[PDB]
Amino acid sequence: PALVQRRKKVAMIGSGMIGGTMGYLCALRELADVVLYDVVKGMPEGKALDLSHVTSVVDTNVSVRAEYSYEAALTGADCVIVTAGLTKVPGKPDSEWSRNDLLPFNSKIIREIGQNIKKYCPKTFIIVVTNPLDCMVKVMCEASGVPTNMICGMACMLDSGRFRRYVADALSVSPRDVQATVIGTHGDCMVPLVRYITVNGYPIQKFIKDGVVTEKQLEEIAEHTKVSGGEIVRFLGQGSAYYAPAASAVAMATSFLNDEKRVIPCSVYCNGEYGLKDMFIGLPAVIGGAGIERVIELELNEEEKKQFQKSVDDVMALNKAVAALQAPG
Amino acid sequence: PALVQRRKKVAMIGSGMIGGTMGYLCALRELADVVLYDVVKGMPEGKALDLSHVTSVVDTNVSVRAEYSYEAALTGADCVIVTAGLTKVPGKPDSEWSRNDLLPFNSKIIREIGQNIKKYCPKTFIIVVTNPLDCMVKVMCEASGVPTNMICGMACMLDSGRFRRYVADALSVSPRDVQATVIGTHGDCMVPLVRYITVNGYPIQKFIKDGVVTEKQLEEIAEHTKVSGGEIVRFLGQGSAYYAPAASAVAMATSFLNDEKRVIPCSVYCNGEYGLKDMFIGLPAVIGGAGIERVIELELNEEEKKQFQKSVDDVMALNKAVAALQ
Amino acid sequence: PALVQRRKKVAMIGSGMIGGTMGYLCALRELADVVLYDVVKGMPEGKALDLSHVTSVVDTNVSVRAEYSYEAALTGADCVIVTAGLTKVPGKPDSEWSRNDLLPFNSKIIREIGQNIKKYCPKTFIIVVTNPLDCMVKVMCEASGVPTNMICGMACMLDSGRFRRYVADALSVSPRDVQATVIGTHGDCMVPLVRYITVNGYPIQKFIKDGVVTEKQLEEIAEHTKVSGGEIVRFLGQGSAYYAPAASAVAMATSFLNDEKRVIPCSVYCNGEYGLKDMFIGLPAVIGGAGIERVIELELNEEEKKQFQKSVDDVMALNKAVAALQAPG
Amino acid sequence: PALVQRRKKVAMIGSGMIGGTMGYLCALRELADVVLYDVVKGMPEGKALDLSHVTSVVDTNVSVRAEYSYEAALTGADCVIVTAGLTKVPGKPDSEWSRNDLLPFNSKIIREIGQNIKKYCPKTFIIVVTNPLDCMVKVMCEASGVPTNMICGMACMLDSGRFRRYVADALSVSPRDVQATVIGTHGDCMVPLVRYITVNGYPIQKFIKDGVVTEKQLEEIAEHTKVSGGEIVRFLGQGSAYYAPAASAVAMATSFLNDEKRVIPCSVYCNGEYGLKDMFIGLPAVIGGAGIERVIELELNEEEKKQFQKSVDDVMALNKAVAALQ
Numbered sequence A, C: 001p002a003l004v005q006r007r008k009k010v011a012m013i014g015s016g017m018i019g020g021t022m023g024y025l026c027a028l029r030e031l032a033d034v035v036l037y038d039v040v041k042g043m044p045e046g047k048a049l050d051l052s053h054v055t056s057v058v059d060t061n062v063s064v065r066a067e068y069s070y071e072a073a074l075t076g077a078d079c080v081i082v083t084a085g086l087t088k089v090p091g092k093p094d095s096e097w098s099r100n101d102l103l104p105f106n107s108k109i110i111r112e113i114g115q116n117i118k119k120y121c122p123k124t125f126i127i128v129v130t131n132p133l134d135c136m137v138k139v140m141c142e143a144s145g146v147p148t149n150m151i152c153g154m155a156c157m158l159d160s161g162r163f164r165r166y167v168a169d170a171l172s173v174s175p176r177d178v179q180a181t182v183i184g185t186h187g188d189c190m191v192p193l194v195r196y197i198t199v200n201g202y203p204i205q206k207f208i209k210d211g212v213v214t215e216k217q218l219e220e221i222a223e224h225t226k227v228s229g230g231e232i233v234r235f236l237g238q239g240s241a242y243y244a245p246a247a248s249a250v251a252m253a254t255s256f257l258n259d260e261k262r263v264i265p266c267s268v269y270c271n272g273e274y275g276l277k278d279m280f281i282g283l284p285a286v287i288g289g290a291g292i293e294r295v296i297e298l299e300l301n302e303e304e305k306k307q308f309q310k311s312v313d314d315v316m317a318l319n320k321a322v323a324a325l326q327a328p329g
Numbered sequence B, D: 001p002a003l004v005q006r007r008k009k010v011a012m013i014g015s016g017m018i019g020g021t022m023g024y025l026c027a028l029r030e031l032a033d034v035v036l037y038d039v040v041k042g043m044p045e046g047k048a049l050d051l052s053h054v055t056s057v058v059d060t061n062v063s064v065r066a067e068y069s070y071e072a073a074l075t076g077a078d079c080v081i082v083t084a085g086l087t088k089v090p091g092k093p094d095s096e097w098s099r100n101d102l103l104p105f106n107s108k109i110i111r112e113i114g115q116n117i118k119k120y121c122p123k124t125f126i127i128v129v130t131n132p133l134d135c136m137v138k139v140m141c142e143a144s145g146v147p148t149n150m151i152c153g154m155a156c157m158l159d160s161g162r163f164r165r166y167v168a169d170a171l172s173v174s175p176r177d178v179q180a181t182v183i184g185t186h187g188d189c190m191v192p193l194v195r196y197i198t199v200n201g202y203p204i205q206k207f208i209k210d211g212v213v214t215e216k217q218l219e220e221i222a223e224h225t226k227v228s229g230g231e232i233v234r235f236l237g238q239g240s241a242y243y244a245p246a247a248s249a250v251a252m253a254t255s256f257l258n259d260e261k262r263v264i265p266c267s268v269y270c271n272g273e274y275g276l277k278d279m280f281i282g283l284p285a286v287i288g289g290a291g292i293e294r295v296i297e298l299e300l301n302e303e304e305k306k307q308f309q310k311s312v313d314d315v316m317a318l319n320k321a322v323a324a325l326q
């Protein structure tokens, strides 16, 4: 009766919209046992019950449980996906929504979760989702102490997914066959690489020359990509996007758990790439069973480097501020 | 280039928790193009954008769009799934939650949607979700005018899914291999058929004799099944269940769209079964390309007949109630 | 960095029709890295290349490789699926095809593979497919020395699958919703349990009473089920069934690898069930991460017991003959 | 009663290794009802039975049947995939295997099938597989008379798949994220476009500079790609590749049936691309619910043009050869 093949276990630290949605993907695909942890009592248990019922409906078998302590939620977790935190600053108008405004509200939460991971599952792969993304990934890395290849932040796959959908619609092709990437920080300074867009590897410039799309059209698509998060915040009225953020985070977790080696841009540790040190920023990377196995350095032209450098300069400033204000404990 | 193969189209009338979740399943599986319709302005556009983004992330290609008029939402819909309505009575305590109290509020919404379906997509397959379920399916049938095999209500597959998950846990087996059914009205009077539970077709009785599960334990599972909706309502604090309800409605929609002929209990039109006529109640059925293709009239023991009659009394009282309101 | 999440590995010992087809299912679903091994050289390498190409076409990433030695094929295998052996006896009419005639040819092959599993992956989960199935599972158990819960033979899921397809067709329902089971040995004495058939747990007797199907039709379906293997052998002309046998063996492996705990009838070790000891025979069982986690004992009626006893007495006779004829070493 | 949603139907004309394998994919994914047709009697019924058994095993519900006549096999087919024909010349040594030699044997089989499609399912989407591919698609177009956007040949997705797998291995990434394309004639003169290789849209050139792979290695990969079909023929001893060929044809059929609009290189009708007219050759195309929806005409450098002209010369000689025969 000795267990030989144990199911993978993914812990959702934060069981709000994105956390619950990721639990749903795990149950739908029989990807792994799921634990839902939140500081709000009762709600995780209700969602865990609902998700457990999904397994019967779609004929899968994984365990979905709510846990109220960090130890019970984190022990044995192959992967930890962190969404705990605020989405909007209370009282501010949707018109002024800014992810950076979340910094003083979420930095302590993320640091605390990191300290618990260090204790309960130091060998886990951490995927941070909480905003402001790139700053939070660095806080998590420092607090959790895991090797730099075992921590990353989900964002660029989401921004790139938006970018891809818009291009797919313009070209009337499946997004599967649009490769479009956003690098940089997850915010107003993100960089949609219009120059790099390909359709099954064929350069977008050919479609322009051939009259399928225009330069302005692509420029508007890049701008739409940049403001997509806020666009959804304004339409929804309460909360922010969750369906695609969840699918992106789970796609990254699956590349790790199944050692797929997919090339997914995400917030990763920099050790010389693009000339950066001791910081995390959105870049193309390969995700496999050894975590972040490669960080891809793209050749940036004049204007791209300029936009990317802006995003770097900003996040370094925020990272300094966060460090200056970190609680001694 | 003339379009020869058109994607199926599913309209979610109601884009709250369950409507958005069903749209997610369609995008995740490339099942069909999706239209999100709701009375609340803005929110459906937000969810449609989010869902359209999902198609790139998971490499599928379906169109997800918000539409604010019945005409744009309903035209061309192969299947219409209706979740529009309230989940709880405003100002009422969680301990006092009752699907039956939703009648006064959701009755006119359902009737209006059916009138529009009659006008814009009379050939569609209708799946109702809005509570009080069995009552709302009848309202929808009367307002929409569709053939009786082309409308049903999602409820029993969810109730059965709960029943199956609890039994699966007790037996330590995959719920894929637990066949357990709930029939009757989706409410306090639903009827979990303990006697009919099977494990890959093997009678639960032998597992009781073998000591894997006890009779008292099965009775507790049936009771838990009955109050599982209210249990989630209380735990959540706001709203009600949505993940399993959406997966159940989509499973039904898929059996229709792909003519799978799955055996799925749902609220179906009674043509004399159990002596019932002109009403909808949860029964085991087969869903295929022609809609409800079979309705199973299981033999009930004394206790089941008694519970089923209470289920029947519940739905007839609700239908009487709407009648006083129509 | 160091690999933290390794892909599962399944070794197909025998790369003929069924072995290559199971390799195909693994590649298609990204289930596990695949190793193809065969005594015939050249062929496994051709199929491994073909299968490696499939991964690109269907966007998955697993390694499919041919291995020439037992050591290279078996080392590190989470599950080993054995199809090595003959399907038909040379120069013999299809009208006379019999799985028992293979006994003298396949006993030695199965014994040798088992001795190599013992050497190279004694902790693996073994799924035997090679005919005559129930006899070969016992030879494999003895030779490999693995715990009795870590070995089973694939047959009843296929026989039950045939049974279910015929019933599904008679009732016009999806076979997902037909629970029909065949127990006993994989051959002319198998026992399709007509009395136990259910449609989503509803007794088949209800459908007979309703006028949808008759007892006579059901008995004809049981007979068809029994002769389905020979029916395909005669239609194909060369070889035997492989699409469904492969799908059945991989479903069983998946239930093990993902600890699904599916209830799948298969040839399993009996230590008291149905009154049998020290032998393998087709029975309903639960397959999970600990291997065969439960052997289900059905309450059989007088006639069912008689049909099952015939199958038991028969396989006990073949097993004794095999033991009698075995080389001391 | 009346069926509203009918399952898709795909007819495999030719039920050997590739035809049976595509049927397997249909049953495995519940993609469509399947018909297996072949000149060989018995075998198709054997595989149809085997495949029908698969549906139960994997919990799907599609109908798999063998059909004796063209009329029964073709009537109602949404898509027809043709693999009928020989794989190698009887008595010819494996070291002398050439798709071009199959011409005299397969051209008549393909013309006959084409005439039958015109008769029984003129509105179907035709995917030809039979070698020598580009030539056989032309034979099929002429005989079947279908709209130019409703016929294509599967080959370059397979050749590109090979190309992508080798590059994926060299780079240590999933082939999902390698975009590599082979255009031209499916034979020794096919053109793997090394310059157009991308890793999730990132130019392969930077990977060369980063030392992940060398130019010499990419060139050896391009050569391996060209001779992969023969490599497999040699290793197998009998017959040729069938798992990836089947997956490639079904992926094409799926993009058509669900109107996915995937960009898949395949043999398509030329209306002037590269000055090519009245012939089929492998080019990047968009396959959707209206069949071939766009043909992409990439800018080629000097070397690519040289290699593509040899590809063009190859199929033009074959088409001239067929013309002389029938």
Ligand SMILES: NC(=O)c1ccc[n+]([C@@H]2O[C@H](COP(=O)([O-])OP(=O)(O)OC[C@H]3O[C@@H](n4cnc5c(N)ncnc54)[C@H](O)[C@@H]3O)[C@@H](O)[C@H]2O)c1
Binding pocket: A013, A014, A015, A016, A017, A018, A019, A037, A038, A039, A040, A083, A084, A085, A086, A087, A088, A102, A106, A109, A128, A129, A130, A131, A132, A133, A154, A155, A158, A186, A239, A240, A241, A242, A245
């Ligand atoms: N990186 C991206 O691409 C991306 C995209 C969308 C949203 N986000 C961010 O992800 C986060 C979660 O979004 P959401 O929609 O799930 O939000 P949500 O409000 O629905 O849920 C956040 C959850 O975290 C919980 N929480 C708060 N403090 C906690 C603590 N100390 N410990 C444990 N749980 C705690 C809350 O109780 C709540 O249940 C936000 O910061 C949001 O801005 C990031």
Ligand SMILES: NC(=O)c1ccc[n+]([C@@H]2O[C@H](COP(=O)([O-])OP(=O)(O)OC[C@H]3O[C@@H](n4cnc5c(N)ncnc54)[C@H](O)[C@@H]3O)[C@@H](O)[C@H]2O)c1
Binding pocket: B013, B014, B015, B016, B017, B018, B019, B037, B038, B039, B040, B083, B084, B085, B086, B087, B088, B102, B106, B109, B128, B129, B130, B131, B133, B154, B155, B156, B158, B186, B239, B240, B241, B242, B245
């Ligand atoms: N049958 C079942 O098994 C089952 C299970 C759970 C919930 N339900 C019921 O399903 C319904 C939906 O639940 P939910 O969680 O999605 O609720 P929800 O509150 O999230 O959304 C209901 C949505 O319908 C909208 N709406 C209201 N009036 C409308 C109208 N006239 N036209 C279009 N949209 C309108 C609301 O604005 C809201 O967005 C409720 O009635 C709930 O009780 C049924």
Ligand SMILES: NC(=O)c1ccc[n+]([C@@H]2O[C@H](COP(=O)([O-])OP(=O)(O)OC[C@H]3O[C@@H](n4cnc5c(N)ncnc54)[C@H](O)[C@@H]3O)[C@@H](O)[C@H]2O)c1
Binding pocket: C013, C014, C015, C016, C017, C018, C019, C037, C038, C039, C040, C083, C084, C085, C086, C087, C088, C102, C106, C109, C128, C129, C130, C131, C133, C154, C155, C158, C186, C239, C240, C241, C242, C245
């Ligand atoms: N249990 C079941 O339900 C079931 C169903 C169908 C077939 N089978 C049996 O499964 C087996 C395989 O069927 P198949 O269609 O794949 O046959 P196949 O002839 O296509 O392939 C069997 C393969 O095993 C190889 N082989 C022979 N001796 C070997 C050895 N010593 N070591 C390694 N490989 C060796 C052969 O070279 C050949 O490639 C047969 O015994 C068949 O009767 C069982």
Ligand SMILES: NC(=O)c1ccc[n+]([C@@H]2O[C@H](COP(=O)([O-])OP(=O)(O)OC[C@H]3O[C@@H](n4cnc5c(N)ncnc54)[C@H](O)[C@@H]3O)[C@@H](O)[C@H]2O)c1
Binding pocket: D013, D014, D015, D016, D017, D018, D019, D037, D038, D039, D040, D083, D084, D085, D086, D087, D088, D102, D106, D109, D128, D129, D130, D131, D133, D154, D155, D158, D186, D239, D240, D241, D242, D245
């Ligand atoms: N385009 C590509 O990329 C590609 C790749 C591999 C193989 N192929 C080709 O595909 C074809 C099929 O390969 P396979 O592996 O399935 O071969 P196979 O020999 O297994 O099957 C060919 C089948 O066609 C049948 N057939 C012959 N004449 C027929 C006729 N007049 N009508 C109906 N059926 C007839 C045969 O009886 C046989 O069952 C071959 O021509 C092969 O060269 C193409």
Ligand SMILES: O=C([O-])C(=O)[O-]
Binding pocket: A099, A131, A158, A186, A228, A229, A230, A240, A241, A245
């Ligand atoms: O971060 C966000 O809220 C987003 O982009 O969806």
Ligand SMILES: O=C([O-])C(=O)[O-]
Binding pocket: B099, B131, B228, B229, B230, B232, B240, B241, B245
């Ligand atoms: O109807 C309900 O709210 C339920 O059962 O989930």
Ligand SMILES: O=C([O-])C(=O)[O-]
Binding pocket: C099, C131, C228, C229, C230, C240, C241, C245
């Ligand atoms: O054993 C067999 O060959 C079968 O049943 O397919």
Ligand SMILES: O=C([O-])C(=O)[O-]
Binding pocket: D099, D131, D228, D229, D230, D232, D240, D241, D245
């Ligand atoms: O056409 C072929 O045989 C091939 O390329 O596999």
